Symmetry: C7
């Protein structure tokens, strides 16, 4: 399980950081902070060792550090690292990843 800055998620949990919100539109129209909701696009920055549901060895999570993923609407857990914001999810809560 790849770690992060003095942190390591346990079991299948994955720690991600949300992408920056869109401040302006294509033509230059700029949006208020209270709008635009929450960003569902994130980057995987830490992965846990894996689950223990299957007997024997450990099954690693499908994602890896450095992947761009689409988060679900709800289910994240707020984590504060070096005054910055990160979100801890479960492995199965991730909707999908942007292959590129």
């Amino acid at each position: 399980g790849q770690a992060f800055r003095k942190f390591l998620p346990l079991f299948d949990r994955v720690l991600v950081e949300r992408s920056a919100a869109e401040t302006v539109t294509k033509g230059g129209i700029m949006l208020p902070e209270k709008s635009q909701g929450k960003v569902l696009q994130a980057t995987v920055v830490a992965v846990g060792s894996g689950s223990k549901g299957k007997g024997g060895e450990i099954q690693p999570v499908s994602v890896k550090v450095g992947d761009k993923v689409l988060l679900p609407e709800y289910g994240g857990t707020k984590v504060v690292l070096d005054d910055k914001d990160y979100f801890l999810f479960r492995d199965g809560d991730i909707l999908g990843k942007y292959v590129d």
Copy 2:
């Protein structure tokens, strides 16, 4: 798991695009946009790698990209790709496919 335009669903989720709504009736009578509800007919455009419930290898989803399927009434997840609309479902949520 067949991908899509810079996207790939995780586990058994399938990404589809709903068919266009019926604007006019057979005799030419046109319908207002607020009507007709939501289209339950979709086309499978992305499939995930598969579930992990069974021990060992991966069980692929029953559908494939290019299939015309009937969606359930509720259960989809809204996804935005290149400003266009797509819906992420589970593999078992699909009611059936139009064999042709």
Copy 3:
């Protein structure tokens, strides 16, 4: 899994059509349409490939196309095929079949 007119249910779902409602009584007394509720007698016209709960091969549904079955009170899903009405159930929701 036996199909139907450009349709095929997925997994253990079975597509049936309900029998016609009774319009008149034995002595000729005829009933209003709003009465008689919904018909619980149906004919199996489409069967899915089967469930995947058991490891290995596929376990087919117990019913076959052409069987007269008794539907449960609730649990069906409305499907429209060639402007006609059909109902999709689960394999285990069927109460029983008329052996004849």
Copy 4:
């Protein structure tokens, strides 16, 4: 699975017919129809093939046609056969049988 008059329950369901209600007492005192509730004593008249929870073959129900059983208070499903009344239960819902 022993059948009935043009009927056969599916899986572990058992079709029974409730015993006739007690109209009079031992000394001749007669009871109104609206009283006496519902009879919990029934006779097994149809049994299904069996469940499929255990892998491999089919496990038949513990009861057989012709057994006098004690029904639970709630859980039955009303079935109409030749204008007569029968009740479909699950195999595990039967409280016990009168051995004689």
Copy 5:
């Protein structure tokens, strides 16, 4: 499965009879019938064949006919045999037995 007077519980159910309520106290003070609640002490008079959760043979219930057991507060089912009163429980609902 040891039976009772023309009765036999099915699966892990156990039929017991509650002990007689305490009418008087040690010093002779008598208690009203509406008081004293319900007796949690019973005697096992019928045991079922056993459950079927484990594959293969049948696992018999831990209790036997003639055991003095402590019933749970709620969970019993009322049964009437020869105008007398008995209670049907599950095997796991019994809190314990008085070894003597």
Copy 6:
């Protein structure tokens, strides 16, 4: 399964007796009876034979008679033995034991 005075818990249930409540403080200040809530410290006095979840033999409970344990806040069952008070818990409900 080590028993108690004419009693034996069934399955994984464990019978304990709560410790005496604290009547006075270190400096001599005494507390009213209605206070101090309920004592979570208990002594294991009876253990059942064990659960049957695992196939084959019986796996005994982790505690033994004579162990000082910390009870959970809620989940106990009141038992009266020789006019004295005991509490029946499940094996997994015990929070921990005081090793000494």
Copy 7:
């Protein structure tokens, strides 16, 4: 399972002690006691023997005594040891550990 001062958790529960709350800010501004909520950072001081879900031997908890862990928002159980405060959690409730 490593113990603590006359205490040992049973099964997969882990006993931890929360870190001291932040009284002052970096620049010297002090915070009231009623503020600052509850500390989610703790140190593992006791670990149980392990779970019994897997057949055979015992699977030990992933954490060890002396680890700095991040607690979940809710789910702990208050324990009093030598007049000091500790919290009992489950093994899977721990969000992650600070690797260092």
